[PDB]
Amino acid sequence: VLEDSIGREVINRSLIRVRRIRIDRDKKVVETGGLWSEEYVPMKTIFFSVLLGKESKESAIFASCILRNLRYVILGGKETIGKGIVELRWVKDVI
Amino acid sequence: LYEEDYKLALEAFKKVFNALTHYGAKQAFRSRARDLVEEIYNSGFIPTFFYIISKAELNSDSLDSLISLFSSDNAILRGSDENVSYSAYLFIILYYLIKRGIIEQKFLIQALRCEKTRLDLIDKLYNLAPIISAKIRTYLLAIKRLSEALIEAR
Amino acid sequence: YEEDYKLALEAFKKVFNALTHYGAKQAFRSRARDLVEEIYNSGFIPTFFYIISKAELNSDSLDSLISLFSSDNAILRGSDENVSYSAYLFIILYYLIKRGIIEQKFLIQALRCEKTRLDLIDKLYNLAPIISAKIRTYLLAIKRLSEALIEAR
Amino acid sequence: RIIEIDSAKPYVWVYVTTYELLKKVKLYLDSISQLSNASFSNLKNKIDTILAKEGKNITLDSDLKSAILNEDFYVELEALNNKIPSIINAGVPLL
Amino acid sequence: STQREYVFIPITNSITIDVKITIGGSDHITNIDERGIHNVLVITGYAVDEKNGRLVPTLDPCDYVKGILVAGTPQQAQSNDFLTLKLPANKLYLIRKKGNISDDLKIYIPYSSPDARNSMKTKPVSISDDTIVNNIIKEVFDKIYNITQKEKVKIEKVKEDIKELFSYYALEQ
RNA sequence: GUUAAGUCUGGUUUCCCUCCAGGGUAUCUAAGCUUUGAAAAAAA
User: Fold this and answer.
1) Taking an 8 Å Cβ-Cβ cutoff, which residues of chain D contact chain B?
2) How far is it, in rounded angstroms, from Cα E143 to Cα E145?
3) Long-range contacts made by residues C64-71, C-beta under 8 angstroms, separation at least 24?
4) C57, C115, C122 member nearest B149 (Cβ)
5) Closest residue of B to C48, CA-based?
6) CATH, residue C75
7) In angstroms, what separates the C-alpha of A6 from chain D's closest C-alpha?
8) In Å, what is the CA distance from D90 to each residue of B45, D58, E165?
9) What does the DSSP assignment read for C22-61?
10) How far, rounded to the nearest angstrom, does the alpha carbon of residue C67 sit from its chain's CA centroid?
11) How much is the CA Rg of chain D, to the nearest whole Å?
């Protein structure tokens, strides 16, 4: 746990910038302009969120049947590059 | 007497642009400006910075013109184009460090001049790392836009 | 009375004629839909740097761009992306010459000599807070004209 | 967002206000102290001793003396009078 | 009608007397009012030949010469080497435009043949060495501008403008 | 024939984003109050 003036730079340089390209499939070289970078968040990164629910007979079913069997989801983009899978922990039953 | 990142980059690029006589030096500096920013991100500022210093081969006379560049608009970077480009990018970075008051000009000229002060510069850069990596990549993004704009692609 | 829409009409006229290939027009349309929101979020100077960086200011295209200020027979050549960024650059510069923000003689003498485009960028950096407020409606009109007249892919 | 200068105290963010907003709060307080028996001499006095320093940029209780805000705008700062309690709760400076 | 005469602003001491006019009219395009110089003509495409200072013509848009504008004709020892011409007061490249013009004028230029004997490789030189700044305020900025030390006590203002607002490209030959 | 000595060179160039999407849908006023109270026939 770092100070905020030092931890900002550390955390920001702690992401993964991968370069990708597009191949000109005739010359089999990089298409002109076809070069870009994508930031990723490392695997095993942890985010914290809350799911709030207002009172209803459905909110009960949601919180007792849906959220209890909701473990893995896909977030964000670049899914076919295998870049979205996420586990949900539910502090309720982790802490 | 505060120049925003883009204004600072403009005034640095002006001297760097007038100091590169042969056009091939300018065209190589363009590629330096286009790749060294993501290098600075990936490998860190300090490693990339000493990498740039080494690729410049300051040569004790490239260094003297590099220093005259700070004073007068009449200076000129001489040497191989692929070395003069790295010396011009080193000037870019030093101009930032100096004008942002992060490191003093005398100390930087010393650490470039001879051997002992260089490791003290390494120490000082590790002390001043969060001050530098805070916003230097925006200044370098401006440098990269300017070099892509004002220098023809090879 | 909104005269920036008439200025947008005449500027769009010039650039819509100066783009021969339809791909260049569609590229200009994408530029128009993107860069106005970009200058809203990011400011004028970063967007201007981005634009001039993707415009390829060689003396060739610079000369076609200068001739656009007079001829209405000038043509912009290059790749579709390059000419679209050059067309948007001409849009901005046209707004700047009109509305008297920049003297046309200074603009032309800067687009000629490479040692003066830097002074041009310096002047534009000095004036950017004014330009950012002025050009919003003009660029929104440019965008509306583009997505009205040029078809999309 | 703030980047410190001339100081030795790390701040990653800061509260920013302007004299126009303070003048508006003062109009609110002045009119409401007359249309009701209530009175807010404390808030009124804080706001008025701030508004007395109009024309200068002011840091409230800190000693920054200079800073660059939101990555773009550089400001010199005076300390108003280092005995004014903060109106905000958190221990962030108020500019 | 009116008629002005351009005089170039070099780093040289060769502009003492080549002219026969001091005021002539009632006002000048170039102005100094507590702010510095204004309405400065920027001749482009021409170089300077400070060896007997004149405006050599070139072909570079990059080459330019700057200078001030006052009424008159040169010394009546000319009319065989000057680029005299009439302008509709709009085609003039001016900076710090403060006072508009009245649709017409006439100007004379210190001019010479392009010297078809050598490649004209130019050199852009500013005017520093403040000693030259002072002898240029005395040489020309006093003789025609008696406004100095009469209404204007701020020499060190008109100083800082002459540094940054006046340059030219030189021949080197 | 014998010896003896290695010397030079140590990453360059290009590409830095392209295309589409730039808002869609619903709601667009509702319910009240629609005149009331004094003066209608005056002295010469």
Assistant:
1) 3, 5, 68, 71-72, 74
2) 6
3) C64/C18, C65/C89, C65/C90, C65/C93, C65/C111, C66/C108, C66/C111, C66/C112, C68/C14, C68/C15, C68/C18, C69/C94, C69/C97, C69/C104, C69/C108
4) C57
5) B145
6) 1.10.520.30
7) 9
8) 34, 18, 52
9) HHHHHHHHHHHHHHHHHHHHH-HHHHHHHHHHTT---HHH
10) 14
11) 15
Selecting from E61, E94, E124 the residue whose C-beta is nearest the C-beta of C112 gives: E61
Report phi then psi at A31, rounded to 5: -60, 145
What's the domain range around C27?
Answer: 3-149
The closest alpha carbon to E60, from C113, C65, B152, B23, belongs to: C113
Min Cα distance D73 → chain B (Å) is 8
Experimental method: cryo-EM
Entry resolution (Å): 2.4
**Phi, then psi, of B131 in degrees rounded to 5:** -70, -30
Unique residue bearing structure tokens 């629910």? A53
Query: Do residues C128 and C45 make contact, with C-beta atoms less than 8 angstroms apart?
Result: yes
How many structural domains is chain E composed of? 1
Interchain CB contact of A6 with B (< 8 Å) = yes
Q: State how far the Cα of B71 lies from the Cα of B86, in Å rounded to an integer.
A: 19
What is the count of structural domains for chain C?
1
- DSSP tag of A65: I
Range of the domain at E173: 1-173
User: What is the CA angle E148-E151-E157, rounded to 5?
Assistant: 60
Which of B96, B102, B89 is CA-nearest to residue B138?
A: B96
Pick C125's closest partner by Cβ from B7, B13, B152: B7
Going from the C-alpha of C135 to that of each of A43, A86, A89, C141, E16, the distances in angstroms are 44, 44, 50, 10, 49
Question: Which bases of chain F are under 7 A from a protein CB atom?
Answer: 11-22
- The C-alpha atoms of residue D78 and residue B147 are separated, in whole angstroms, by 40
> What is the DSSP pairing of strand D58-59 with strand D78-79?
parallel
Inter-residue contact A73 to A86 (CB < 8 Å)? yes
Listed in sequence order, the residues at least 6 apart from E15 whose beta carbon sits closer than 8 Å to its beta carbon are: E7, E8, E53, E139, E140
CB B83 within 8 A of CB B62: yes
Cα–Cα distance measured from residue B32 to residue B140, given in angstroms and rounded to the nearest whole number: 11
CA–C1' D26–F32 (A): 38
